[PDB]
Design a protein around this nucleic acid. Structure first.
Lengths: 121, 131, 88
RNA sequence: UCGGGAGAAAGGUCGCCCUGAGCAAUCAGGGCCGCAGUGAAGAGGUCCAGGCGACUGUUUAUCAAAAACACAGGGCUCUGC
RNA sequence: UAGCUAGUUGGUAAGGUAACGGCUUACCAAGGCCACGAUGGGUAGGGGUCCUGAGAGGGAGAUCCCCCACACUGGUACUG
RNA sequence: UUAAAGGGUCCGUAGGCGGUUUAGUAAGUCAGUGGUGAAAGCCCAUCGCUCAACGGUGGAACGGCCAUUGAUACUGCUGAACUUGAAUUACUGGGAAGUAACUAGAAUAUGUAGUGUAGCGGUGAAAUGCUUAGAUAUUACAUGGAAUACCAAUUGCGAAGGCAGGUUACUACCAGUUUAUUGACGCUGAUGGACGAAAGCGUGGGGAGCGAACAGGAUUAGAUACCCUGGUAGUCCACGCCGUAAACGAUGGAUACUAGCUGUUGGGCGCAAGUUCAGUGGCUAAGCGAAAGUGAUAAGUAUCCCACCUGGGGAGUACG
RNA sequence: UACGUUCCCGGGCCUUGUACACACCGCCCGUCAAGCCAUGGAAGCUGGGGGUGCCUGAAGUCGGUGACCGCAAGGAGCUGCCUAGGGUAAAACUGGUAACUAGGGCUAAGUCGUAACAAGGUAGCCGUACCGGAAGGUGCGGCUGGAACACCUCCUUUCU
């Protein structure tokens, strides 16, 4: 508006709140799972999505989504969370890297092998 | 008032929009200098300095074409304002209408145009610009 | 503040040039007179906000004139405030 | 409840001699003595939380001093000389 | 985060430090800062620079160079 | 204006902006010179690694700062002058503009007295209710409280809230015009001050009608409501307290320009026509707007100042 | 037998209002009951830095004394100020946790009612006060951001 008003109090710039916050601004974070279960999407989708409660190394409890099919993910397993939410499960805001320290990859996968951690046949 | 120069430009703009013939603005040294510059550049037909007032009047005749009138003054605006004064040396003069318009610049010598002052290499304060 | 033509002529002649009804000194004297003669009415009509606001407006006008005098001539300001008992 | 709580709580000096600044007082520097210097006697223990009663006050002389009575304040009702 | 500071503000004489100075001491006065942000809290080494952007701007301060601070955590002095 | 956004309204402190002419300085502004703005890095040009990356050299850049010399058009400062802005004075007027004190009538309620008998009241229909202890109805008188039919309205006044029976006193404000007078004394205005519908709170009166809550009757499957019969606080007065509204023109305050038609309010000039200021409505051109619409009393074209807005919910919520 | 279209049902046209458009057999509101999530209050519990007021205070620089070593200097020995560290007392900031408790967002769309959207069947909304299982009801004031209707009782003038 007025130049005098701008000189008195200028324009306020906001901070642009981040997307992935509970991983300490790191690309990947190691964690241990405590409860691997299945949830439902909101609507109108109908499925049984596989999620796991992961406790990261910085003391943060998050819900991660297991991509693909075929995994072990016992009650205690070392997983590597990377990030990336889903628009179906309310609360799950992270993903697990397939091919990490303890998590399994995929078998019979030939198209998207860089993802899902699959070796070249 | 708050800006006699802004009023002088606004009266001309309103008369051009309303398709008038003459304007009877109040007078002052700066307004007379601007009127002389505009008449030398060819944006107005004629001007008369009318006496018999405590301040004096300036009667300006606006110019239109003899067919498809199309007033030659399309946009006459200000750059310096009483709330923000903008000065510039002889390197930051504007480029009004890509060299096709005029920019009045009050210089240390007098009132000149943005192109007539860059040759003299003097700066000053940009007052207004006309297309 | 019952102001008559004779009272105004007297309050202007007291400061000089009774025909000079535009002098800042005479205007300040008139304002002070009709403020002193109104703050007393406001003591028996304490619920007369309509005249309280007019008294505030007169105070504002007198303060504007006093500021004009202060900015133009520093001596006349002191003289007028000392003779009229204004500014606390 | 703006008055209190509150001396809240928690701490420091105190003797004798000399010098100086000082309004008598007192203060500031040194030195000396003893386990101890307001060297004896007299002079608040404090804090936290709850029940009752706002408070000062009065009460079973001679086993009960209180949460009991009173109290300022609030209310209903009677009374025209 | 609306009051802060009691050697604090100024002065007079000494002690001083390479050197002026409340740097320190003795005496006198109550001053000094504060809405143009004192004080208090959080964060952070600063710059030349790097990325981006038509530009105005915005975001960081690795590697190269300059300045400052530190050497297990703190204090003190000697030699020079 | 209707998408998020004009403070409820004025006064005013700090601050921001400044009518015309003229003299002086040159602080801002402009130009030149000297010093500096390290090296490295980016860009340009040119050479050596077979090209490139890389390296060497040169220029530009480093938008900046200090000293000095000039110009004076614009802003700031000092001095002087002017009336157009502003204010004061004089004459004609203008109003539900405020505060205080008196006073009038109609109507409702109650009481007394006279007449008189079976209903009155209410609803879409009923009932609760008052009545043979004489109601409703009518006449005369008395008591008390609140509000003012006709005038009366896109009227008028007030900064806003708001202001209506009549009279007086004490004030305030506004408009026009032959005057006279001062000479920029002006606009806005964060903190701040004052006023501020109704409802609400404290103390003391008053209480006719209305009536939150509440009690009965009725409707409904139910009716903590709409409907009916009563009714406390309140509505009223004298001192105070809070400071909220769809406090709305959902449109901040100034100044200057830009087509008309048609009413009306108060002035001036007019023997009438009609003309010119100050307010108040309607139609509409250009112009604005996403459109609805606005349109000389702008939401049209400019300048100054203040407040506010930055997806919805959470939320005007939590904490202080 | 039919006086007739004021009512019941269905259909057509014009205008009007709409928060509906798979189009009122629409949309949508609130409480209660069952889960998941994050954030407040709270008797208490447990910490983290920094500040201030006292006591004690190592080494070290700088003063006093120095009756003992030395021929003078000087030193030994006592001792004073300053100050790391330790102890103590009351507060300020801030983190975690806690029986219980208030409200918010979703889940399958469970129970109860139909408050708003048409004149939404009592027009709606704003401020305020009271009341009620709940949406909500009522009193006072204000707005149209509401629909349907929407020109009039007196007809004409003398200075009272």
């Amino acid at each position: 508006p007025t130049i005098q008003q701008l000189v008195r109090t200028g324009r306020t710039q906001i901070t642009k709140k981040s997307k992935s916050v509970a991983l300490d601004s790191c690309p990947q974070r190691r964690g241990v799972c405590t409860r691997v279960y299945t949830t439902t999407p909101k609507k109108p989708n109908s499925a049984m999505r596989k999620v796991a409660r992961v406790r990261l190394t910085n003391g943060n409890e998050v819900n991660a989504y297991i991509p693909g099919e075929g995994h072990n993910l016992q009650e205690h397993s070392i997983v590597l969370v990377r990030g990336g939410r889903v628009k179906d499960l309310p609360g799950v805001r992270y993903h697990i890297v397939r091919g990490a320290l303890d998590t399994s990859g995929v078998a019979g996968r030939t198209q998207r092998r860089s993802k899902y951690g699959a070796k070249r046949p | 008032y708050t800006d006699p120069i802004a009023d002088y430009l606004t009266r001309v703009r309103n008369a051009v929009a309303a398709n008038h013939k003459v304007v009877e603005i109040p007078a002052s040294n700066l307004k007379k200098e601007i009127t002389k510059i505009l008449f030398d550049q060819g944006y107005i037909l004629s001007y008369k300095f009318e006496q018999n007032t405590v301040q004096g009047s300036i009667k300006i005749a606006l110019k239109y074409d003899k067919d498809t009138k199309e007033p030659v003054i399309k946009d006459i605006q200000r750059i310096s304002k009483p709330g923000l004064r903008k000065y510039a040396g002889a390197a930051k003069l504007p480029r009004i209408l890509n060299g096709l318009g005029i920019a009045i610049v009050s210089t240390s010598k007098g009132l000149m145009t943005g192109k007539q002052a860059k040759q003299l290499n003097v700066g000053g304060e940009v007052i207004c610009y006309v297309y | 503040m019952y102001l008559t033509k004779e009272k105004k002529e007297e309050i202007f002649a007291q400061h000089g040039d009774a025909k000079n009804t535009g002098k800042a000194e005479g205007q300040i004297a008139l304002f002070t007179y009709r403020i002193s003669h109104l703050t007393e009415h406001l003591k028996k009509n304490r619920h007369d906000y309509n005249t309280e606001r007019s008294l505030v407006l007169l105070v504002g006008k007198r303060r504007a004139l006093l500021d004009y005098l202060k900015r133009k001539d520093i001596n006349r300001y002191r003289e007028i405030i000392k003779v009229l008992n204004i500014r606390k």
